[PDB]
Amino acid sequence: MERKFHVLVGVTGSVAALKLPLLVSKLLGLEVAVVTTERAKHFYSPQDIPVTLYSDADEWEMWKSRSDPVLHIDLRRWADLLLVAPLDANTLGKVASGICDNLLTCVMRAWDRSKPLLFCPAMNTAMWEHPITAQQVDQLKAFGYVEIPVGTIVDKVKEV
Amino acid sequence: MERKFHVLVGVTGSVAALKLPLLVSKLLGLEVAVVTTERAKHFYSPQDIPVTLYSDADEWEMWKSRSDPVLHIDLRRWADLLLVAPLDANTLGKVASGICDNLLTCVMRAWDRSKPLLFCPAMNTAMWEHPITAQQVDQLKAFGYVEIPVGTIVDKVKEV
Amino acid sequence: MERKFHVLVGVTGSVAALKLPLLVSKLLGLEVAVVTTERAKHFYSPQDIPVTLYSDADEWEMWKSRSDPVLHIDLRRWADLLLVAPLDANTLGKVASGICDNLLTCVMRAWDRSKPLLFCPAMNTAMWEHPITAQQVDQLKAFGYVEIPVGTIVDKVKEV
Numbered sequence: 001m002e003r004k005f006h007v008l009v010g011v012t013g014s015v016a017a018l019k020l021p022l023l024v025s026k027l028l029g030l031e032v033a034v035v036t037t038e039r040a041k042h043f044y045s046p047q048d049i050p051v052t053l054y055s056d057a058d059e060w061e062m063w064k065s066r067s068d069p070v071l072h073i074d075l076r077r078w079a080d081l082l083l084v085a086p087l088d089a090n091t092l093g094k095v096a097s098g099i100c101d102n103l104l105t106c107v108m109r110a111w112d113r114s115k116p117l118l119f120c121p122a123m124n125t126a127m128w129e130h131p132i133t134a135q136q137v138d139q140l141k142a143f144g145y146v147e148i149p150v151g152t153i154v155d156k157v158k159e160v
Numbered sequence: 161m162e163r164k165f166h167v168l169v170g171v172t173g174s175v176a177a178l179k180l181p182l183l184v185s186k187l188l189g190l191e192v193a194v195v196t197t198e199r200a201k202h203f204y205s206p207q208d209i210p211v212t213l214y215s216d217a218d219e220w221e222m223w224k225s226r227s228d229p230v231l232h233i234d235l236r237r238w239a240d241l242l243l244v245a246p247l248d249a250n251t252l253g254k255v256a257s258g259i260c261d262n263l264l265t266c267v268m269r270a271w272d273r274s275k276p277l278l279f280c281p282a283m284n285t286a287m288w289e290h291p292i293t294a295q296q297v298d299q300l301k302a303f304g305y306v307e308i309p310v311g312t313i314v315d316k317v318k319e320v
Numbered sequence: 321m322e323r324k325f326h327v328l329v330g331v332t333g334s335v336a337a338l339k340l341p342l343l344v345s346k347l348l349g350l351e352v353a354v355v356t357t358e359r360a361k362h363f364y365s366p367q368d369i370p371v372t373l374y375s376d377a378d379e380w381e382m383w384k385s386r387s388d389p390v391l392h393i394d395l396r397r398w399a400d401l402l403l404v405a406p407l408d409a410n411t412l413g414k415v416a417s418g419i420c421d422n423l424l425t426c427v428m429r430a431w432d433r434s435k436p437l438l439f440c441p442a443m444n445t446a447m448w449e450h451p452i453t454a455q456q457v458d459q460l461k462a463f464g465y466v467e468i469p470v471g472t473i474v475d476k477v478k479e480v
């Protein structure tokens with residue numbers, strides 16, 4: 001039951017999000033939406049992204065009863081593909097450790113295996129030139145989230 | 161030196177806490193107290209729980225000098241049994257990784273082996289139908305915290 | 321290119337920071353600076369430390385453009401030695417899991433192998449008398465951060 005593809009772009013606190021607009025305008029048969037972390041918003045302005053932006057607070061403001069919706073859940077059953085550009089050293093360790101403390105990491109931890117989750121770490125030489133990152137990126141591969149160590153990402157989205 | 165049993169119920173951010181009142185009114189020779197996470201309080205109202213509710217802020221407001229008490233510590237030497245109903249996918253990963261960033265997870269990480277800590281994960285099909293949860297729940301078993309994958313829990317509390 | 325040694329003292333939320341001033345006044349050819357966590361500041365007052373104190377907020381207030389500086393980065397290229405006295409059970413698990421959610425843990429996760437990072441866990445009998453702490457302290461040794469399970473620390477700083 002798929003027509004226009006539903007892609008969900010997750011954004012974290014890396015200077016890379018500075019470029020996030022580019023990704024959106026490009027990536028936009030696709031049909032997108034971005035979900036951010038708070039710090040990520042430190043690299044771009046909402047207006048510079050012509051799409052629906054879901055944030056932590058967004059989830060809780062719409063829930064007041066068991067009848068009410070569960071944004072992170074609602075978003076997980078809506079995306080056909082979940083791209084996370086960029087994935088910071090922090091969220092990597094959160095995901096690596098099944099830590100859902102924000103709307104993003106929760107969408108991920110509730111993800112659908114059946115659907116694809118391509119990510120692309122984007123830290124700094126230092127943070128990257130450290131161990132864990134490896135023991136974690138592949139530890140993350142254990143769930144096969146298609147790494148990507150703009151452009152490259154863009155094309156890679158499709159690849160039907 | 162035990163008369164009336166001291167049970168400590170921990171509550172996290174799962175819709176399950178919606179039921180938390182039930183547990184309390186039932187579980188209440190037992191003598192209880194609940195310790196929550198902030199988000200958990202998103203599923204119940206304090207008044208609907210006829211017991212002392214300890215929260216993060218509670219710890220710090222009472223400490224101003226080395227002489228002063230350490231709530232999370234004080235609570236760890238007071239409970240005979242520590243039930244955590246529900247344990248969310250998030251706190252599981254916190255506990256799994258020895259992460260004490262809130263009054264709950266700290267009480268746990270300072271726990272007494274000598275005393276029992278029965279817990280019961282309570283996420284959603286998705287979040288649960290994911291890996292880590294397993295590599296973690298049993299990773300958590302390594303410390304033997306008696307899983308429980310209301311009712312069932314209730315009875316299980318006792319079982320002298 | 322080293323003259324006066326640059327030591328960076330990290331402080332976390334353990335009652336031990338109560339003593340932090342001592343360390344500073346002593347440790348001060350050395351030339352120091354302290355980087356704290358928020359909770360840590362619950363055990364000492366800034367004024368009681370005659371040095372530049374870097375805090376989370378400090379990083380973000382100085383960054384508004386890609387041209388702008390990256391405190392946690394700037395601090396990582398400036399320290400010759402990074403001592404973390406005390407390292408709480410919490411930050412241990414953060415570091416263990418490559419979790420940079422605050423200025424401290426970020427400086428660490430971006431650390432320079434080439435430079436030394438001596439730390440000294442400082443929790444409580446309980447929190448310490450637990451497993452993970454071990455599977456973690458040595459898991460932390462994997463990156464060789466020179467444990468130290470005031471005084472002892474002080475001398476140990478030097479040891480040219």
Ligand SMILES: Cc1cc2nc3c(=O)[nH]c(=O)nc-3n(C[C@H](O)[C@H](O)[C@H](O)COP(=O)(O)O)c2cc1C
Binds near residue numbers: 012039122124391
């Ligand atoms: C100016 C600046 C640039 C940063 N750049 C990066 C980066 O490129 N990659 C990374 O992993 N972390 C970077 N960080 C650290 C993260 O912002 C910090 O880990 C944050 O907690 C991540 O939060 P999040 O996971 O909610 O987005 C940077 C911090 C600052 C102040």
Ligand SMILES: Cc1cc2nc3c(=O)[nH]c(=O)nc-3n(C[C@H](O)[C@H](O)[C@H](O)COP(=O)(O)O)c2cc1C
Binds near residue numbers: 100106175198248
């Ligand atoms: C309406 C709603 C329902 C949620 N239900 C669950 C759940 O049933 N299980 C779970 O692990 N997380 C659930 N979450 C996500 C947690 O609330 C989020 O992980 C939170 O950070 C946990 O915080 P805590 O550990 O401080 O309680 C839900 C979020 C929302 C908004």
Ligand SMILES: Cc1cc2nc3c(=O)[nH]c(=O)nc-3n(C[C@H](O)[C@H](O)[C@H](O)COP(=O)(O)O)c2cc1C
Binds near residue numbers: 220230231331332336
């Ligand atoms: C009075 C008091 C004393 C505490 N002492 C310690 C301690 O000695 N060691 C430890 O690991 N945690 C201790 N904690 C718990 C930490 O403060 C809590 O884990 C905190 O989140 C650590 O935050 P940080 O990593 O940002 O500093 C204490 C808490 C309180 C209220």
